[PDB]
Design a protein around this ligand. Structure first.
Ligand SMILES: *[C@@H]1O[C@H](CO)[C@@H](O)[C@H](O)[C@H]1NC(C)=O
Ligand SMILES: [Ca+2]
Lengths: 321, 267
């Protein structure tokens, strides 16, 4: 049943850190979870004997030596953990062998938008989450399948998002675009508008100079905007966004704040406006009245100027002729 | 350091705090801080990256938080502890323990737990990436994990809370996936067995104990409470001699009664 090298217990087959290339033939029929992490497993290592008699639903294959997307996997597998590898391409035939997949973890690889096959995720209308963090990516794939709820494209090299890339992904709950080359013109017109059941959008550490517009208000609870060169907030940026509970605006050079930008925000409870001083006084007279808001309780880690401190009295610090 | 209260014999639920919006997670205090602060990190698969801190139980119930600690990496499971102002936790998809200095917001260290199984490989009965459990007692810092040399069988380790280094490793002959949760008191492993959500009355008690000092281990039957049928995390405190249990959403404290501390030898 179980090999000399690999040892199993009640379905869970632990063939990890053993340091070998091929998957051992000694794979039991009543399989639950296939552990194959921290090994030397290459692309030829995976044999044909990994379907037809495999009851597996979760296969872990991180810290391995395989190139390309894995081939010959049990049809009813839901979790495909493929991390810290040199997977370049994701073809139709390779993905097609596992139709009932729920979670595809491609964190730390080399999958580019050019490297991913056109219409690979076509017959993949069962995927709940796809992680493509730190890959050779340049654009949001676009050929991405429906029923996706978690798409993490963080710490990549993605520069541009097109309108039909996220158009149709709607069912999506959380979009994580962190540490990327997304500029304001790099961020497509009315790009997120379409994503109705989106609870979380993360744009942390990018290249956008002004807080996005045409953002979903329909169901968006969180919006993470930090480590960007945001100076000007467009009036219609935080408009029709009622359902927003958390907004993060820290580590952003907001020199100004327009009169009644947060008006359309009602559910708002947590705000993070810290790490940007010298900004107070003129035009921000409304903040003094606003931050002192009606019930319920108030929570905001706001901003306050450095050179001035209290508008009361007269400055007269200018003494030159 | 801290004085040993004796051998644990009776576990009784004495305090009932609030109910979480998460079925799993961990909540604990710092036994080296004279302040009555509370640290709460609810489990959210692949999304656990923030530790919440509370000043009092009143604030902890009403959901009034003191501050939030965003962590430079994702956390795996409900293992975490808070010792001398620095939290220790299992960094996600690794066998590393990360010392993180709170109220300085800096990674002071990172300890590679040699040959440890991680990421739902050797977890508790409920899984949830609870492969490595940090532990604070009278003898200090601990790591309750498991190696595939043992193959599922729990492996405990003394861990320097200041230099983050393994100060000993003891192999136990009891499965981890069988364990619902485990903890340390006077360097003694108390391993909790409880029913979950076929789901027959397997048992609701600590059935095994391993003694670090002397390396001896025996079978027990210490009646452990599982009223909510899903034990998420159990963390002992040597300062107030209490268990800081999380159970199927229920955030609760479990009181202890201690008997005479005894150890027999014959190698
Ligand atoms: C949001 O949209 C998805 C689309 O598949 C739907 O299944 C879901 O019920 C909707 N509502 C919520 C609260 O997720
Ligand atoms: Ca514990």
């Amino acid at each position: 049943s179980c090999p000399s090298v690999c040892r199993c217990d009640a379905g869970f087959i632990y063939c990890n850190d053993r340091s070998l290339t091929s998957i051992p033939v000694g794979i039991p029929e009543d399989a639950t979870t296939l552990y194959l992490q921290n090994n030397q497993i290459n692309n030829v290592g995976i044999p044909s004997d990994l379907k037809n008699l495999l009851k597996v639903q979760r296969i872990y294959l991180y810290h391995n030596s395989l190139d390309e997307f894995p081939t010959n996997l049990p049809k009813y597998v839901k979790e495909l953990h493929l991390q810290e590898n040199n997977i370049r391409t994701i073809t139709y035939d390779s993905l097609s062998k596992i139709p009932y997949l729920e979670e595809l973890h491609l964190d730390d690889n080399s999958v580019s938008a050019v490297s991913i096959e056109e219409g690979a995720f076509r017959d993949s209308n069962y995927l709940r989450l796809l992680f493509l963090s730190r890959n050779h990516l340049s654009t949001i794939p676009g050929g991405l399948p429906r029923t996706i709820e978690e798409l993490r494209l963080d710490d990549n090299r993605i520069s541009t998002i097109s309108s039909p890339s996220l158009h149709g992904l709607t069912s999506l709950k959380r979009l994580v675009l962190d540490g990327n080359l997304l500029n304001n013109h790099g961020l497509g017109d009315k790009v997120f508008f379409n994503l109705v059941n989106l609870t979380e959008l993360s744009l942390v550490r990018n290249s956008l100079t002004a807080a996005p517009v045409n953002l979903p208000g329909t169901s968006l609870r969180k919006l993470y905007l930090q480590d960007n060169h945001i100076n000007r907030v467009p009036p219609n940026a935080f408009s029709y966004l009622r359902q927003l509970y958390r907004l993060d605006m820290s580590n952003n050079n907001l020199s100004n704040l327009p009169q009644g930008i947060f008006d359309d925000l009602d559910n708002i409870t947590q705000l993070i406006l810290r790490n940007n001083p010298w900004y107070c006084g003129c035009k921000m007279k409304w903040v003094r009245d606003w931050l002192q808001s009606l019930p319920v309780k108030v929570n905001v880690r706001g901003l306050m100027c450095q050179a001035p401190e209290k508008v009361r009295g007269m400055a007269i610090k200018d003494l030159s002729a | 350091v801290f004085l040993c209260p004796g051998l644990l014999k009776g576990v009784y639920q004495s305090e009932h705090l609030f109910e979480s919006d998460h079925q799993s997670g961990a909540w604990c205090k710092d036994p080296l801080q004279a302040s009555d602060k509370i640290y709460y990190m609810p489990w959210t698969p692949y999304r656990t990256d923030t530790l919440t801190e509370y000043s009092s139980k009143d604030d902890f119930i009403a959901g009034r938080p003191t501050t939030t600690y965003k962590l430079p990496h994702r956390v795996d499971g409900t293992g975490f502890v808070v010792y001398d102002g620095a939290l220790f936790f299992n960094k996600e998809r690794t066998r590393n323990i990360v010392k993180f200095d709170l109220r300085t917001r800096i990674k002071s260290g990172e300890a590679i737990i040699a040959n440890a199984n991680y990421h739902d490989t050797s977890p508790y009965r409920w899984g949830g990436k609870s492969d490595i459990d940090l532990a604070v007692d009278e003898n200090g810092l601990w790591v309750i994990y498991a190696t595939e040399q043992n193959n599922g069988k729990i492996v405990i380790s003394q861990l320097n809370p200041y230099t983050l280094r393994i100060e000993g490793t003891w192999d136990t002959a009891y499965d981890k996936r069988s364990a619902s949760n485990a903890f340390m008191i006077c360097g003694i492993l108390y391993v909790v067995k409880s029913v979950y959500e076929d789901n027959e009355a397997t048992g609701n008690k600590i059935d095994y104990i391993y003694n670090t000092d002397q390396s001896k281990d025996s079978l027990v039957d210490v009646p452990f409470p599982n009223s909510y049928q899903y034990i998420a995390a159990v963390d002992y405190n040597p300062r107030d001699n209490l268990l800081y249990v999380w159970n199927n959403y229920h955030v609760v404290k479990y009181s202890l009664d201690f008997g005479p501390l005894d150890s027999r030898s014959g190698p």
